[PDB]
Amino acid sequence: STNNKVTVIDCHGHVLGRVASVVAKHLLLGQKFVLVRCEDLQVCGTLKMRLVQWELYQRKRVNTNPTRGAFHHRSPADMVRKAVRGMLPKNNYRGKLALKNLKCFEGCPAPYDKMKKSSIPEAAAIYSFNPTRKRTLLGELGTAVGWKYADVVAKNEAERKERAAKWYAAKQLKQKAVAEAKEKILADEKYKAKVAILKKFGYA
Amino acid sequence: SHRKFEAPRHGSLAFHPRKRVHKVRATVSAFPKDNAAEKPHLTGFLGFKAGMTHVIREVKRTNTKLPKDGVLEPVTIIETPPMVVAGFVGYKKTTTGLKPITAVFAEHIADEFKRRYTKKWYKNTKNQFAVHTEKYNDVKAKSKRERQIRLIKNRCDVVRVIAHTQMALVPLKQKKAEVMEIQINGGSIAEKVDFAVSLLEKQISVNSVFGTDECIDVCSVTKGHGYNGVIKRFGVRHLPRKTHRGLRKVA
Amino acid sequence: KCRLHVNAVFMGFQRAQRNQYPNVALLQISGVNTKEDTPFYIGKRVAYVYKVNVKKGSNKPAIRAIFGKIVAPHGNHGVVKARFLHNLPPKAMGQNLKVFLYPSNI
Amino acid sequence: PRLLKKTEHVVIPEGVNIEINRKNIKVTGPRGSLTREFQHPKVDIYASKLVVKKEGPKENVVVIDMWYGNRRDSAVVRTIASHIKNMITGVTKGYQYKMRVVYAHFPVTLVIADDGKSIQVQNFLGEKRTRHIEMYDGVVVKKLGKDEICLEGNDVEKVSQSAANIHAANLVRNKDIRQFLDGVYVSEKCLIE
Amino acid sequence: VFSRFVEVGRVVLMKTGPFASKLAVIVEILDHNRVLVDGPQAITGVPRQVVNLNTISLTSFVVNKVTRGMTHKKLCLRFTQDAIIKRFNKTATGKAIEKRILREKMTDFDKFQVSIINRKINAAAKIAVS
Amino acid sequence: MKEYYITARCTDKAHNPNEIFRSRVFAPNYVVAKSKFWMMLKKQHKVKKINAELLQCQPIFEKNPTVVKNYQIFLRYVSAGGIHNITKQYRDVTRVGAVRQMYNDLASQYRTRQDKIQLISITTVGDKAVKNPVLHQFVGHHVKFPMVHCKPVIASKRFNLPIKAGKLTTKLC
RNA sequence: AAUGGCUGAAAGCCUCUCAAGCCAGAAUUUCGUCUAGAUGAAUACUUUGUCUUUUUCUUGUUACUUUAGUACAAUUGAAAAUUAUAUACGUUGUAUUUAUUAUCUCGUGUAUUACUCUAUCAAAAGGGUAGUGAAUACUGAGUUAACAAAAUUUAAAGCAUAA
RNA sequence: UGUCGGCUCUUCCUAUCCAUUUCAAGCAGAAUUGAAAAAAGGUAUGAUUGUUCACCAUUUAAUAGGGAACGUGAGCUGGGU
RNA sequence: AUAAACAUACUUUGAAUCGGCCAAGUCUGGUAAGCAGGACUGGCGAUGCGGGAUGAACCGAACGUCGAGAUAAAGUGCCAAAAAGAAACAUAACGAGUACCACAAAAGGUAUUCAUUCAUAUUGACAAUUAUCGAAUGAAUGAGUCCUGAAAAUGGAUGGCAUUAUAAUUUCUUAACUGAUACUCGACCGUU
C-alpha cells in the first residue's frame, strides 16, 4: 500500500545521535517522520564541553569566501537535521528524497500537537547512559551559541501543558463514566449469552 | 614570508558586501527596547534633509576650556511636516521572529497613500481601498474589524502604526507619499491598541515624538558615486610614479 | 474489501560495500523481527503492484504487477530474499510489497 | 572500590519538621523555613526511625542511602547529609558570621542601609570608588561595634557567600599584600544562639 | 525506601529463555550480577541454575525461612507453605500471564465473535452515558 | 574452557619408563590441552613428544554444578616490566566457570592476553578467606540489595520493535 | 578562561571539587546594536472556488475561451512530569502501513458522538449554544450474488474581454 | 614552474613586544623579574648598504618573532646577480 | 618414504632483456632519511578482483561467458549488505577507536583499579573532642587505565555523521550473520 501517515517522535528524554540513526534508516524505507521538541534532546557532555565542540565546529569556514563556507545553524531543529543528514546518502536522488520526509519544530505546532507520539527505545537516555554522566539539552546549548527563540518555545510549551491538562481531566471523567457503564451492562442478565463467550477467553 | 611592516587593513569588513540599495527610504532594522512601565508613545518619525548651516552655541558644560563666547558647530536641517496615521499592525513573537497578524486600516485614505500600491498611476484605475472604503460601515465589515482589534489584544506583542507623509507640503516633485511603520513603546498591549486606534486618520507632529535636547539615531542612504576605484573605495596607497600600467590599484 | 496481504518494504538488492546484485531483492516483512519467524514466509508469493498513468487511447493496463517468491532469510533481523520474474526497478526502493498467504501449507 | 551500601542519617530535633518530595527537602523550624534541591541521580532520601545511640532509644531520622557505586559517587552521601544537618541548625539556631575591618592609615566607613539588605564601603585605602556589595535574600548585615559587622541568616550557604562577597570586593591590587593588610576579614563563624 | 530487594528467598519471575513466565526462588547471591535460582523443579520446573539479573524480575513475595544454599527438599516445603502459586495468580502480572496463554489458543472463529461482541458492548456502554 | 586429565610417560635413555606425568589442564578443547601438557614436560623435564607416549586424556566434569563455591586461583603472568605472581578469588559453581572469569578479568584490568598467563593452581577457600574488597560484600548470609534502573526485559527478539508507541519507563524492578 | 573564594565529602580532621552544588572574575563569548541576506508574513486591488495537460495571445502574468474526462458532507492521530520515579502495582509478550460482519430494502422511538451542515456568540480553540442530517446500540426480518465487469490519479485545441 | 631585494596588499601561526585579567618575588612605594588566560586590536621615522643582515640617531604604550611555491615580475622597479 | 608417461632427455633456429623498485622476527656506511649498497625468499614491473575510506608493492586470492551455494581477508549504530548476550579497566576529554599507516618521549600526580610484603589491628588502632569516640588504620613496592608533559602557519579530518554502565577499548558465549573474478555443483565457448 501507500503509507501516508506520519510517525511523530517526541524527542523528549532521548539522545541526539541515537535518534538520528534510527530515523535516518527508516527515512530510506519510505516512512515520513516529524520530530517534535527537537530542543529537548540530550548530548553527552557538560555545557563547558559542548561549547568547545561548537567552537571547533565554527572554525571550519572557507577562508577566501565565508559566504560559501560551512553554515553553522544554531537552532536545535537544525542541529538534528544536520545530524540526520550525515547518516543519509549524499548527492543522489535517494538521499534527497529521504530527507524531504523529516521535520523538527522546537515545540508542537498546530497539526502535530494532537497526533499519537512514538518513542525509540534504542535512543532513550535511560537505557544508554550512566545516570551520573552529565548531559546537555539542545535548547540549553543552543541559547549559549546564539539561538534567540529559546524563550518563545518555553512560553508556547507552557500554554500547551495547560490546555492538555484540562483536556485530559475532561477525558478522564468521561472515561470513568463509560467504564462504570460497561460494568453495569456486563453484569446485566440479558447480556449473559455474549459475556459467557468473553469470560471464556478472558476478555471480560 | 611575513610582511616587512604592519599597518591596519584598509576598509571595514563590517559593511562587506558593498551592495547598493534599491529604495531611497531606509527602514530601521530595530527599535528601542520596549519598557512596559510607561505611557504609550511613538518611537520614530521621517523627515527630508534640506541642507546644512552653522550656529554659534554657548557652552554649558563645566570643567571645560572651551571659549566663553561660543563654539562654532555645523548643523543639518531636517524638514519634518506632520504625518498622517492611516492604519496599524500587530506583530506576534513566533519561532521565526516577528510575524504580522493583522493590519487594520482607516476609513479614509489619501491619494498619496494609494500611489504606493501601483507603478503607472496615470494609467491605473485608482481603485485602491475602494472596496474597503465603500463597505467600511457595513455590519459584516464592522464585525470583522472588531475581531481584528480583539485578535491583536489576545495574540500579539508588538504594535506599529502605519504613518505616511504629505508630499504637498514639501518642494519635492514626488507626489506618492513615504510610508513608515512607527512602533508604539509603552504600556500593556491592551492600551497600545487603544492608543493606536485613537490615532487613526489623525495627524502627528514631530514634537510629540521627540523632546528637547534629545539624542536620537538617524538612518538614511548615503550619496551615490557610481563605479569607483580602490583608492576612493578603500583608501589604499597610490603606487609610485614609475609603475607600468597605472598607479591607482592594489599591486 | 479485505486485507489478505502483509506489507513488505523493498529495502534494496543483495549487495556488498561496493557491488550490487539485482537478481535478489531484500524485503522487510511487517511484524517479523527475527529470523526464527521467517520459516513461515519462505515460499509465499510476493507482488510489486504499481500504477502507470496511461493515456486514454492506450490499451495497456493502468495497474501492472511483478510477482515473485520469498526464497531464504537474510540476517538475524527477519529480512528475506525474494526473486522476481523481472528485477524490481531501483526507483521502487522504500515502497510497499504485498506478501500474500499462498502457496498455503496450513 | 564499589560499596554495596553507603548510609548516612541526620537526626531531627523536636521543633523541626522535614518533608521530602523527590529529593526536595523542605525544613521548617522555630526560626523559619528552608528549602533545597539535591539533584543527584543516585541518592535515596527518605524519613524513618532509627536507633542511633548504643543504649539510647529510637528517634526520628532522615536516611540518605546510596547502593552500589564508585567512590567518586559514594562521597555524596555524607555531603548531602551535612547539607541537611546545616538546615536543621539554620532554622533552629541560625548562623552568624562576624567580620572585622582592618586598615593601616585610612579609616574605612561602612554605610549600612536601613533594611540591612545592603552595605556600603567607603574610603578603602584612600580610594574614591565606593563598593556596594549586595546581600542574598535572608541575609542581614548589622554593625556590631567599632570596625566590626556581623551577618545574620538561616542558610549557611547564603550567609558565608555574602560574607565572602564583602571581602572579595576589598582586595589590594598591584601592591605587596604582605604589607597592605587591608580589607574586611571573617573573624569567626558561629551560631546566633 | 525500595520495596523489592534481591535477597535470599525472594521470589523472582523468569522473563526470557526456555522457562519464560515461570516462577523461581533465589537461594544464593554470587555477586551483583548473578544469582542462583532454584524455583522448585518439582513444582514449577525451573532447575537449580545461575542466571543473570537482566533476565529475571522481582515480585512482592519472599519465602519465609529460606537460608542460602537451601536444599531442594526443604525449599519445596517452604514454597507450598507460603502458597506462592495461590498468591501470585491474583496479582496483575499473574493475571497477565494467564491472559497470554488464553489468547494464544484462540482460533479465527474465536477472534471473530470477540471482536463482534466487544464492539457492540463498547458502543452500547458509550450510549448509556449522558 | 574445559578441564582435562592428561597422563604420559617418557621412553628413552634418560628417563625410566615407570614414572607417569599427570596434569589437570584447562583448555578450550583436548587438542589445546595436550599442547599445553607437552610444553610443561619439555620446559620442565626435557621430555619431547617424539620420545614419549600419551596414555589418557579424559574430560573432568564438575561433581556438583549446583553449589556455590569460592575459588582461589594462583597464577603467574608476564607484563612489560617482568613476571609476577597473583592470587585472585572468584565465586562460581564450576571450576571451569571460574577460570573463564579469571581469563576475562586479567585481559581487562591488566590488559594481559591469554598467552601470558600460567595457572599454577586452583583451590576452594572458606567464606571468611575471601579478601577481594568487592567479592567480600556478598559472602555473608544477609546480603540484600535492590536492583534499580532496571531496563524492561523482552521475552525474545520477536517483540523487539524499532519504534515503540507512547513513553518509555525504567523499572524499580 | 586563567585565578581567587563559599558550602563540602572522599579520608570523623583538612581541602575551591583529578566529587556532586554555588560566587566573583578578561582588550573574552553570547544576547542587544550595525551591514548584506534565503524560505517567508500582513495588507490593498484583480480574480477564482474539484482538478490537469497539450496548444495558444501578450513585452510578460493572471483571469479568460473551446472539446472532453474526473469526485461529489458525514466513525482519522494528544495527559503531563519523573526514571534512586510519595506508598501500592509492575499492570507481562509485536509502533505506522494495518483493527468496520458482503450489497440493498423494510422497519419504532430513545440515546450517544474530538462526526457533517446551517444560524449565532466567539476564536490565531480537536470552543459554547440551537437545529438538521450520518453512523452506531437497543435489534429484527427480508432480497441478490454463480459467467463478465468492477479505477480516478488528465488529455486535446484557443485570444473576445478585463486587471 | 621567470631565478635576489625593495614597494603595494590580504590572510594565517604563537614560541606575546604593548594594551586587558591573574598568581609569585630576595614584591615597602616607584621601577622591574618569573609565570597563566588570551592572537579580537596595535607594533613607526631616518643616515650608510642592491643587500636579507647589520650598526647607529630619534619617536613611541610597544616600536615581537615567523608562514603563505624562501607569498606577491601578463602587480611595478632592474639597484644586485 | 613421497611424487612423476601430455614423464623424461633433449636438438636446431631465433626474439626480447640485462636503468629496476618494494617488503622483511636481515646486514654494512651514515645523526638520520621515502638516503646509499648487499645475503635468502616473495612480490610490483607484466596484475585485474574482495578488504585496509583513498594508495604499484600490505591482507585474502590471481581472471574464458554465466546460474545457484557454501567461504577468505575482514566486518555487523547510519552512510553500508550483516549480531544478540556477558564481565570489566576506560570515558566530565577534539580521551578511545580497522595492522603496514601516516607520529610522540623522559619525568611527575594524596587520580583510579588490582596484587604482594610489613606494622597497628580490642576489649579498644587511627581522626577529632588518660577517658569518650568504636572498625578497620598506616607504610613500601609493583602491574593496568587517566591527567600534566603536548607550541605553526588556508578551514578539516577515528573516512564522515555520531557514541559515552558505548555505537570505545581488552577478553569471551551462541551449529549467529554478511562477503571475492578464489572453492563446489551445473550450462555453454575455446586449447590440450
Side-chain angles (χ1 to χ4, degrees), chain A residues 46-71:
Chain A
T46 68
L47 189 41
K48 156 175 295 321
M49 264 175 30
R50 297 319 301 185
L51 285 171
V52 181
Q53 319 305 314
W54 179 260
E55 269 210 293
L56 288 171
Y57 180 37
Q58 251 191 29
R59 277 199 85 227
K60 327 294 192 275
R61 172 207 86 180
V62 167
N63 185 70
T64 72
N65 203 346
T67 86
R68 307 176 92 116
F71 304 130

mmCIF file of all heavy atoms in Angstrom, chain A residues 46-71:
data_model
loop_
_atom_site.group_PDB
_atom_site.id
_atom_site.type_symbol
_atom_site.label_atom_id
_atom_site.label_comp_id
_atom_site.label_asym_id
_atom_site.label_seq_id
_atom_site.Cartn_x
_atom_site.Cartn_y
_atom_site.Cartn_z
ATOM 1 N N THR A 46 29.053 18.115 29.489
ATOM 2 C CA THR A 46 28.678 19.315 30.212
ATOM 3 C C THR A 46 28.639 20.506 29.263
ATOM 4 O O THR A 46 29.155 20.461 28.145
ATOM 5 C CB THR A 46 29.661 19.581 31.348
ATOM 6 O OG1 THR A 46 30.935 19.934 30.799
ATOM 7 C CG2 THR A 46 29.826 18.340 32.188
ATOM 8 N N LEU A 47 28.011 21.590 29.724
ATOM 9 C CA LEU A 47 27.889 22.774 28.882
ATOM 10 C C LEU A 47 29.250 23.330 28.497
ATOM 11 O O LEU A 47 29.411 23.872 27.400
ATOM 12 C CB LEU A 47 27.059 23.841 29.591
ATOM 13 C CG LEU A 47 26.654 25.050 28.747
ATOM 14 C CD1 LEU A 47 26.241 24.621 27.352
ATOM 15 C CD2 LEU A 47 25.539 25.819 29.425
ATOM 16 N N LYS A 48 30.237 23.212 29.383
ATOM 17 C CA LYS A 48 31.588 23.636 29.037
ATOM 18 C C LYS A 48 32.161 22.783 27.914
ATOM 19 O O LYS A 48 32.786 23.308 26.988
ATOM 20 C CB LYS A 48 32.481 23.575 30.272
ATOM 21 C CG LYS A 48 33.952 23.416 29.964
ATOM 22 C CD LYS A 48 34.779 23.491 31.230
ATOM 23 C CE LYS A 48 34.681 24.866 31.855
ATOM 24 N NZ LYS A 48 34.668 25.935 30.821
ATOM 25 N N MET A 49 31.956 21.467 27.976
ATOM 26 C CA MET A 49 32.489 20.588 26.941
ATOM 27 C C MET A 49 31.762 20.784 25.621
ATOM 28 O O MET A 49 32.377 20.708 24.554
ATOM 29 C CB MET A 49 32.393 19.129 27.383
ATOM 30 C CG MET A 49 33.667 18.592 27.992
ATOM 31 S SD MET A 49 33.506 16.925 28.646
ATOM 32 C CE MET A 49 32.247 16.270 27.576
ATOM 33 N N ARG A 50 30.452 21.024 25.669
ATOM 34 C CA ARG A 50 29.690 21.191 24.436
ATOM 35 C C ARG A 50 30.081 22.462 23.697
ATOM 36 O O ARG A 50 30.013 22.504 22.465
ATOM 37 C CB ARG A 50 28.194 21.201 24.738
ATOM 38 C CG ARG A 50 27.657 19.910 25.322
ATOM 39 C CD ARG A 50 28.250 18.696 24.645
ATOM 40 N NE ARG A 50 27.973 18.681 23.216
ATOM 41 C CZ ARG A 50 28.297 17.685 22.406
ATOM 42 N NH1 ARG A 50 28.911 16.604 22.855
ATOM 43 N NH2 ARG A 50 28.001 17.777 21.113
ATOM 44 N N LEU A 51 30.478 23.507 24.426
ATOM 45 C CA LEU A 51 30.856 24.757 23.781
ATOM 46 C C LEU A 51 32.203 24.645 23.085
ATOM 47 O O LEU A 51 32.436 25.319 22.078
ATOM 48 C CB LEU A 51 30.882 25.889 24.804
ATOM 49 C CG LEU A 51 29.513 26.408 25.236
ATOM 50 C CD1 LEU A 51 29.644 27.361 26.400
ATOM 51 C CD2 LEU A 51 28.832 27.082 24.073
ATOM 52 N N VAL A 52 33.104 23.815 23.610
ATOM 53 C CA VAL A 52 34.379 23.594 22.938
ATOM 54 C C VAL A 52 34.158 22.923 21.592
ATOM 55 O O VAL A 52 34.763 23.304 20.585
ATOM 56 C CB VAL A 52 35.321 22.770 23.833
ATOM 57 C CG1 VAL A 52 36.652 22.569 23.144
ATOM 58 C CG2 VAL A 52 35.510 23.459 25.166
ATOM 59 N N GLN A 53 33.283 21.917 21.549
ATOM 60 C CA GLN A 53 32.985 21.260 20.283
ATOM 61 C C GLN A 53 32.346 22.229 19.300
ATOM 62 O O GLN A 53 32.640 22.192 18.102
ATOM 63 C CB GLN A 53 32.075 20.055 20.513
ATOM 64 C CG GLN A 53 32.423 19.224 21.733
ATOM 65 C CD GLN A 53 33.861 18.756 21.732
ATOM 66 O OE1 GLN A 53 34.365 18.271 20.720
ATOM 67 N NE2 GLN A 53 34.530 18.891 22.871
ATOM 68 N N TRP A 54 31.461 23.100 19.786
ATOM 69 C CA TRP A 54 30.862 24.102 18.913
ATOM 70 C C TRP A 54 31.898 25.109 18.438
ATOM 71 O O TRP A 54 31.857 25.555 17.287
ATOM 72 C CB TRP A 54 29.720 24.818 19.626
ATOM 73 C CG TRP A 54 29.110 25.862 18.774
ATOM 74 C CD1 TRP A 54 29.347 27.198 18.824
ATOM 75 C CD2 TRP A 54 28.176 25.658 17.713
ATOM 76 N NE1 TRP A 54 28.611 27.844 17.866
ATOM 77 C CE2 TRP A 54 27.882 26.918 17.169
ATOM 78 C CE3 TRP A 54 27.552 24.531 17.175
ATOM 79 C CZ2 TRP A 54 26.994 27.085 16.114
ATOM 80 C CZ3 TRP A 54 26.673 24.699 16.128
ATOM 81 C CH2 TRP A 54 26.401 25.964 15.609
ATOM 82 N N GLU A 55 32.826 25.492 19.315
ATOM 83 C CA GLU A 55 33.886 26.409 18.919
ATOM 84 C C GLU A 55 34.766 25.797 17.840
ATOM 85 O O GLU A 55 35.190 26.489 16.908
ATOM 86 C CB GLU A 55 34.722 26.797 20.134
ATOM 87 C CG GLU A 55 34.227 28.035 20.845
ATOM 88 C CD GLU A 55 35.348 28.806 21.505
ATOM 89 O OE1 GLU A 55 35.946 28.278 22.466
ATOM 90 O OE2 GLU A 55 35.635 29.939 21.062
ATOM 91 N N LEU A 56 35.066 24.502 17.958
ATOM 92 C CA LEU A 56 35.777 23.807 16.890
ATOM 93 C C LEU A 56 34.949 23.773 15.614
ATOM 94 O O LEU A 56 35.485 23.939 14.514
ATOM 95 C CB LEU A 56 36.131 22.387 17.328
ATOM 96 C CG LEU A 56 37.235 22.238 18.372
ATOM 97 C CD1 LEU A 56 37.312 20.805 18.864
ATOM 98 C CD2 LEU A 56 38.565 22.677 17.796
ATOM 99 N N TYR A 57 33.641 23.550 15.742
ATOM 100 C CA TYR A 57 32.779 23.490 14.567
ATOM 101 C C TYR A 57 32.731 24.828 13.843
ATOM 102 O O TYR A 57 32.812 24.877 12.612
ATOM 103 C CB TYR A 57 31.374 23.050 14.978
ATOM 104 C CG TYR A 57 30.392 22.964 13.835
ATOM 105 C CD1 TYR A 57 30.789 22.525 12.582
ATOM 106 C CD2 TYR A 57 29.065 23.314 14.012
ATOM 107 C CE1 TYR A 57 29.896 22.446 11.540
ATOM 108 C CE2 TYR A 57 28.165 23.236 12.975
ATOM 109 C CZ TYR A 57 28.586 22.801 11.741
ATOM 110 O OH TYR A 57 27.693 22.721 10.700
ATOM 111 N N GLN A 58 32.611 25.926 14.587
ATOM 112 C CA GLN A 58 32.515 27.239 13.961
ATOM 113 C C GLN A 58 33.797 27.640 13.246
ATOM 114 O O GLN A 58 33.769 28.557 12.419
ATOM 115 C CB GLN A 58 32.160 28.290 15.006
ATOM 116 C CG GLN A 58 30.759 28.823 14.885
ATOM 117 C CD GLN A 58 30.540 30.040 15.748
ATOM 118 O OE1 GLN A 58 31.472 30.795 16.017
ATOM 119 N NE2 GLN A 58 29.305 30.242 16.188
ATOM 120 N N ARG A 59 34.917 26.984 13.546
ATOM 121 C CA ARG A 59 36.175 27.332 12.898
ATOM 122 C C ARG A 59 36.188 26.917 11.434
ATOM 123 O O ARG A 59 36.812 27.591 10.608
ATOM 124 C CB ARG A 59 37.340 26.683 13.638
ATOM 125 C CG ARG A 59 37.806 27.448 14.852
ATOM 126 C CD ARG A 59 39.205 27.027 15.248
ATOM 127 N NE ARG A 59 40.220 27.751 14.495
ATOM 128 C CZ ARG A 59 41.265 27.183 13.912
ATOM 129 N NH1 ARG A 59 41.469 25.879 13.984
ATOM 130 N NH2 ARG A 59 42.124 27.941 13.238
ATOM 131 N N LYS A 60 35.519 25.820 11.096
ATOM 132 C CA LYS A 60 35.502 25.324 9.724
ATOM 133 C C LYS A 60 34.726 26.295 8.849
ATOM 134 O O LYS A 60 33.496 26.356 8.916
ATOM 135 C CB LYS A 60 34.884 23.933 9.675
ATOM 136 C CG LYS A 60 35.161 23.091 10.900
ATOM 137 C CD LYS A 60 36.630 22.764 11.020
ATOM 138 C CE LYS A 60 36.860 21.689 12.054
ATOM 139 N NZ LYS A 60 36.964 22.258 13.419
ATOM 140 N N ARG A 61 35.440 27.051 8.023
ATOM 141 C CA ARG A 61 34.825 28.094 7.221
ATOM 142 C C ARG A 61 35.756 28.428 6.070
ATOM 143 O O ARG A 61 36.964 28.559 6.269
ATOM 144 C CB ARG A 61 34.549 29.335 8.071
ATOM 145 C CG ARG A 61 34.098 30.541 7.292
ATOM 146 C CD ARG A 61 34.485 31.807 8.024
ATOM 147 N NE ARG A 61 35.838 32.237 7.699
ATOM 148 C CZ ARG A 61 36.419 33.318 8.201
ATOM 149 N NH1 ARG A 61 35.793 34.102 9.062
ATOM 150 N NH2 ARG A 61 37.659 33.617 7.830
ATOM 151 N N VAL A 62 35.188 28.563 4.871
ATOM 152 C CA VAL A 62 36.003 28.803 3.685
ATOM 153 C C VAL A 62 36.762 30.111 3.854
ATOM 154 O O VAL A 62 36.165 31.171 4.079
ATOM 155 C CB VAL A 62 35.135 28.810 2.426
ATOM 156 C CG1 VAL A 62 35.910 29.374 1.258
ATOM 157 C CG2 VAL A 62 34.677 27.408 2.113
ATOM 158 N N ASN A 63 38.089 30.040 3.749
ATOM 159 C CA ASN A 63 38.931 31.193 4.045
ATOM 160 C C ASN A 63 38.700 32.324 3.053
ATOM 161 O O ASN A 63 38.552 33.485 3.445
ATOM 162 C CB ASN A 63 40.400 30.775 4.048
ATOM 163 C CG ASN A 63 41.327 31.901 4.457
ATOM 164 O OD1 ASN A 63 41.356 32.309 5.616
ATOM 165 N ND2 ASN A 63 42.093 32.410 3.503
ATOM 166 N N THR A 64 38.670 32.008 1.761
ATOM 167 C CA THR A 64 38.568 33.050 0.750
ATOM 168 C C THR A 64 37.163 33.617 0.614
ATOM 169 O O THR A 64 37.009 34.726 0.095
ATOM 170 C CB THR A 64 39.035 32.517 -0.602
ATOM 171 O OG1 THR A 64 38.065 31.600 -1.119
ATOM 172 C CG2 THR A 64 40.368 31.812 -0.458
ATOM 173 N N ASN A 65 36.145 32.896 1.060
ATOM 174 C CA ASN A 65 34.776 33.379 0.949
ATOM 175 C C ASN A 65 33.894 32.694 1.983
ATOM 176 O O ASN A 65 33.380 31.601 1.729
ATOM 177 C CB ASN A 65 34.238 33.135 -0.458
ATOM 178 C CG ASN A 65 33.108 34.064 -0.813
ATOM 179 O OD1 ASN A 65 32.540 34.720 0.052
ATOM 180 N ND2 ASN A 65 32.774 34.128 -2.093
ATOM 181 N N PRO A 66 33.701 33.295 3.156
ATOM 182 C CA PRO A 66 32.855 32.657 4.175
ATOM 183 C C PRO A 66 31.404 32.499 3.762
ATOM 184 O O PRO A 66 30.700 31.676 4.357
ATOM 185 C CB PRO A 66 32.996 33.595 5.379
ATOM 186 C CG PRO A 66 33.402 34.886 4.803
ATOM 187 C CD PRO A 66 34.266 34.563 3.634
ATOM 188 N N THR A 67 30.925 33.265 2.779
ATOM 189 C CA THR A 67 29.558 33.078 2.309
ATOM 190 C C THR A 67 29.370 31.710 1.677
ATOM 191 O O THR A 67 28.262 31.166 1.697
ATOM 192 C CB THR A 67 29.179 34.166 1.310
ATOM 193 O OG1 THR A 67 29.606 33.775 0.001
ATOM 194 C CG2 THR A 67 29.834 35.480 1.678
ATOM 195 N N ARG A 68 30.428 31.149 1.094
ATOM 196 C CA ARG A 68 30.385 29.773 0.618
ATOM 197 C C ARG A 68 30.660 28.769 1.725
ATOM 198 O O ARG A 68 30.374 27.581 1.550
ATOM 199 C CB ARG A 68 31.409 29.564 -0.495
ATOM 200 C CG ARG A 68 31.309 30.540 -1.639
ATOM 201 C CD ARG A 68 32.434 30.311 -2.629
ATOM 202 N NE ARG A 68 32.041 29.390 -3.686
ATOM 203 C CZ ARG A 68 31.947 29.716 -4.966
ATOM 204 N NH1 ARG A 68 32.223 30.936 -5.391
ATOM 205 N NH2 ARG A 68 31.563 28.795 -5.842
ATOM 206 N N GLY A 69 31.191 29.222 2.855
ATOM 207 C CA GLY A 69 31.718 28.320 3.854
ATOM 208 C C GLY A 69 30.643 27.496 4.516
ATOM 209 O O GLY A 69 29.450 27.655 4.272
ATOM 210 N N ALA A 70 31.090 26.575 5.366
ATOM 211 C CA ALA A 70 30.159 25.735 6.098
ATOM 212 C C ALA A 70 29.214 26.605 6.908
ATOM 213 O O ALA A 70 29.642 27.550 7.573
ATOM 214 C CB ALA A 70 30.916 24.772 7.008
ATOM 215 N N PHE A 71 27.926 26.298 6.832
ATOM 216 C CA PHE A 71 26.893 27.070 7.504
ATOM 217 C C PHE A 71 26.549 26.386 8.816
ATOM 218 O O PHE A 71 26.126 25.226 8.823
ATOM 219 C CB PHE A 71 25.660 27.202 6.621
ATOM 220 C CG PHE A 71 25.949 27.793 5.281
ATOM 221 C CD1 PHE A 71 25.502 27.183 4.128
ATOM 222 C CD2 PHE A 71 26.678 28.957 5.176
ATOM 223 C CE1 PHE A 71 25.773 27.726 2.898
ATOM 224 C CE2 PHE A 71 26.949 29.503 3.949
ATOM 225 C CZ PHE A 71 26.496 28.886 2.808
#
